[PDB]
Design an enzyme around this catalytic site. Structure first.
Site, PDB file in Angstrom:
ATOM      1  N   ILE A  17       0.869  -1.199   0.235  1.00 52.93           N
ATOM      2  CA  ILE A  17       0.173   0.124  -0.115  1.00 52.93           C
ATOM      3  C   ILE A  17       0.771   1.354   0.137  1.00 52.93           C
ATOM      4  CG2 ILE A  17      -1.708   1.436   1.258  1.00 52.93           C
ATOM      5  CD1 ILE A  17      -2.707  -1.066   2.597  1.00 52.93           C
ATOM      6  N   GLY A  18       2.018   1.365   0.807  1.00 51.57           N
ATOM      7  CA  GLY A  18       2.827   2.408   0.885  1.00 51.57           C
ATOM      8  C   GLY A  18       4.023   2.095   1.945  1.00 51.57           C
ATOM      9  N   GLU A  19       5.036   3.320   1.860  1.00 53.01           N
ATOM     10  CA  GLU A  19       6.034   2.942   2.680  1.00 53.01           C
ATOM     11  C   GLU A  19       6.403   4.447   3.129  1.00 53.01           C
ATOM     12  OE1 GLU A  19       8.821   1.983  -0.122  1.00 53.01           O
ATOM     13  OE2 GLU A  19      10.407   1.178   1.334  1.00 53.01           O
ATOM     14  N   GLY A  20       7.609   4.426   4.030  1.00 53.83           N
ATOM     15  CA  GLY A  20       7.800   5.452   4.959  1.00 53.83           C
ATOM     16  C   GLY A  20       9.385   5.699   5.332  1.00 53.83           C
ATOM     17  N   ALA A  21       9.667   6.446   6.323  1.00 48.88           N
ATOM     18  CA  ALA A  21      10.952   6.278   6.879  1.00 48.88           C
ATOM     19  C   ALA A  21      11.733   5.136   7.383  1.00 48.88           C
ATOM     20  CB  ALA A  21      11.039   7.513   7.903  1.00 48.88           C
ATOM     21  N   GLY A  23       9.279   2.292   8.139  1.00 49.68           N
ATOM     22  CA  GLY A  23       8.255   1.028   8.017  1.00 49.68           C
ATOM     23  C   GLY A  23       7.712   0.943   6.618  1.00 49.68           C
ATOM     24  N   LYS A  40       1.138  -2.548   9.526  1.00 48.87           N
ATOM     25  CA  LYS A  40       2.572  -1.790   9.245  1.00 48.87           C
ATOM     26  C   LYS A  40       3.634  -2.362   9.871  1.00 48.87           C
ATOM     27  CE  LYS A  40       2.575   1.924  11.584  1.00 48.87           C
ATOM     28  NZ  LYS A  40       2.240   3.384  12.099  1.00 48.87           N
ATOM     29  N   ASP A 135       0.564  16.438  14.465  1.00 48.16           N
ATOM     30  CA  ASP A 135       1.121  16.245  13.117  1.00 48.16           C
ATOM     31  C   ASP A 135       0.005  16.120  12.283  1.00 48.16           C
ATOM     32  OD1 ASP A 135       3.638  14.444  11.408  1.00 48.16           O
ATOM     33  OD2 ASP A 135       2.743  16.298  10.875  1.00 48.16           O
TER      34      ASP A 135
HETATM   35  O1  LIG Z   1       0.297   4.205  10.578  1.00 52.25           O
HETATM   36  C1  LIG Z   1       0.073   4.406   9.384  1.00 52.25           C
HETATM   37  N1  LIG Z   1       0.569   5.184   8.577  1.00 52.25           N
HETATM   38  C2  LIG Z   1       1.761   6.352   8.908  1.00 52.25           C
HETATM   39  C3  LIG Z   1       1.593   7.513   8.501  1.00 52.25           C
HETATM   40  O2  LIG Z   1       0.474   7.821   7.518  1.00 52.25           O
HETATM   41  C4  LIG Z   1       3.010   5.623   8.579  1.00 52.25           C
HETATM   42  C5  LIG Z   1       3.147   5.163   7.093  1.00 52.25           C
HETATM   43  C6  LIG Z   1       4.482   4.460   6.656  1.00 52.25           C
HETATM   44  C7  LIG Z   1       5.564   4.409   7.508  1.00 52.25           C
HETATM   45  F1  LIG Z   1       6.569   3.691   7.066  1.00 52.25           F
HETATM   46  C8  LIG Z   1       5.269   4.612   8.982  1.00 52.25           C
HETATM   47 CL1  LIG Z   1       6.648   4.271   9.868  1.00 52.25          CL
HETATM   48  C9  LIG Z   1       4.116   5.271   9.394  1.00 52.25           C
HETATM   49  C10 LIG Z   1      -1.057   3.604   8.691  1.00 52.25           C
HETATM   50  C11 LIG Z   1      -1.687   3.662   7.559  1.00 52.25           C
HETATM   51  C12 LIG Z   1      -2.638   2.621   7.472  1.00 52.25           C
HETATM   52  C13 LIG Z   1      -3.486   2.154   6.288  1.00 52.25           C
HETATM   53  N2  LIG Z   1      -4.605   1.479   6.456  1.00 52.25           N
HETATM   54  N3  LIG Z   1      -5.373   1.222   5.191  1.00 52.25           N
HETATM   55  C14 LIG Z   1      -4.515   1.863   4.114  1.00 52.25           C
HETATM   56  C15 LIG Z   1      -3.536   2.518   4.936  1.00 52.25           C
HETATM   57  C16 LIG Z   1      -2.411   3.466   4.016  1.00 52.25           C
HETATM   58  C17 LIG Z   1      -2.821   4.544   3.315  1.00 52.25           C
HETATM   59  C18 LIG Z   1      -1.983   5.462   2.621  1.00 52.25           C
HETATM   60  C19 LIG Z   1      -0.502   5.086   2.829  1.00 52.25           C
HETATM   61  C20 LIG Z   1      -0.015   3.926   3.525  1.00 52.25           C
HETATM   62 CL2  LIG Z   1       1.707   3.636   3.820  1.00 52.25          CL
HETATM   63  C21 LIG Z   1      -0.986   3.260   4.242  1.00 52.25           C
HETATM   64  C22 LIG Z   1      -2.646   2.007   8.782  1.00 52.25           C
HETATM   65  N4  LIG Z   1      -1.636   2.430   9.509  1.00 52.25           N
END
Ligand SMILES: O=C(N[C@H](CO)c1ccc(F)c(Cl)c1)c1cc(-c2n[nH]cc2-c2cccc(Cl)c2)c[nH]1
EC number: 2.7.11.24
Length: 344
Positions: A17-21, A23, A40, A135
């Protein structure tokens, strides 16, 4: 693509679904509840700052229960601390986030009104727990196919401490720039609930326009944008700012007049611009509070105090995390996650 995403026997069928710093988030099938969830993965333990944001999110989210706030229904990690390199957090699965919506979709007044309500309804719960999100922004707002909104990512959240809010001028900050309240750049550490209300106001403006209201490109430029629209702060507001370097900087500025909201947002609902004005009020003491926002006429068709619940157990004085080392932060993350272990 899906790297070392080792969710145990219970969750299968992963989609990126997506990425980040530090995780990654994937969708998966909960073979127990048969419902498809979001998971996550977190790999924070190398940096103390990451362990600090992971611990804060977990303590808070495990203690919160609200429809407009994302939950933690399960946590997966190694049985021992020596073996734990990552942590997985199971949370609500939502189709999209608001940041992605504003890029391609134009929101109807109905949607703006409904999104705003859900944000305020959940923010009320957070603030009633004496907690600041710190935030709030489009990407931290999740929506599902029926437009249910849930706030996520409490890695920056802190317990309110208005008595220790005053700081020096241009003091370093962490929250997202475009949604940073003016006082942050002036004399505030961001320890009062009024910080969140500002961001929500910036989010309201962005929902009306599909573009950021104060898109500063760096730290001080952020203040320029805000003052460019709100105009010079009144004498009465300046007197509330006692710090000399902060007041003098504001004094050194040419006089500017307020740019009419209806001038910025022509097609906008007047009731919406009136509330927007109350949210984006320069003086944080005069700024509208979350329960006043909910009761504002613009949100009349949703407003219902008895259907807007507050926290059962409010957090007390701050969690004292800024101090402890990675090692101790990892133990606390370990013990806070124990309850989800089958050996428990
Ligand atoms: O904690 C969450 N996200 C935080 C900041 O948004 C985070 C995103 C990456 C990372 F690497 C970190 Cl450390 C934190 C989260 C999203 C969903 C989530 N449910 N359903 C969809 C999602 C989702 C939507 C858009 C993008 C993503 Cl990626 C996931 C749960 N929990």
């Amino acid at each position: 693509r899906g790297q070392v995403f080792d969710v145990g026997p219970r969750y299968t069928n992963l989609s990126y679904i997506g990425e980040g710093a530090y995780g990654m988030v994937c969708s998966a099938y909960d073979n127990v509840n048969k419902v498809r969830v979001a998971i996550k993965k977190i790999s924070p333990f190398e940096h103390q700052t990451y362990c600090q944001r992971t611990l804060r999110e977990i303590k808070i989210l495990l203690r919160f229960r609200h429809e407009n706030i994302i939950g933690i229904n399960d946590i997966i990690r190694a049985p021992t601390i020596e073996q734990m390199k990552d942590v997985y957090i199971v949370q609500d699965l939502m189709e999209t986030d608001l940041y992605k919506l504003l890029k391609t979709q134009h929101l109807s007044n109905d949607h703006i009104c409904y999104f705003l309500y859900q944000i305020l309804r959940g923010l009320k719960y957070i603030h009633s727990a004496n907690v600041l999100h710190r935030d709030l922004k489009p990407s931290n707002l999740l929506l599902n196919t029926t437009c249910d909104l849930k706030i996520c990512d409490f890695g920056l959240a802190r317990v309110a401490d208005p008595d220790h809010d005053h700081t020096g001028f241009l003091t370093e900050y962490v929250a997202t720039r475009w949604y940073r309240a003016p006082e942050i750049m002036l004399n505030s550490k961001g320890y009062t609930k009024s910080i969140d209300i500002w961001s929500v106001g910036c989010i309201l403006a962005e929902m009306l326009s599909n573009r950021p209201i104060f898109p500063g490109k760096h730290y001080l430029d952020q203040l320029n944008h805000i003052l460019g629209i709100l105009g010079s702060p009144s004498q009465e507001d300046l007197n509330c700012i006692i710090n000399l370097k902060a007041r003098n900087y504001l004094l050194s500025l040419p006089h500017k007049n307020k740019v009419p909201w209806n001038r910025l947002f022509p097609n906008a609902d007047s009731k919406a611009l009136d509330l927007l004005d109350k949210m984006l009020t320069f003086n944080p003491h005069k700024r509208i509070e979350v329960e006043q926002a909910l009761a504002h006429p613009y949100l009349e068709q949703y407003y219902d105090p008895s259907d807007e619940p507050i926290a059962e157990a409010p957090f007390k004085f701050d969690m004292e995390l800024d101090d402890l080392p990675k090692e101790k932060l990892k133990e606390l993350i370990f013990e806070e996650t124990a309850r989800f272990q089958p050996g428990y």
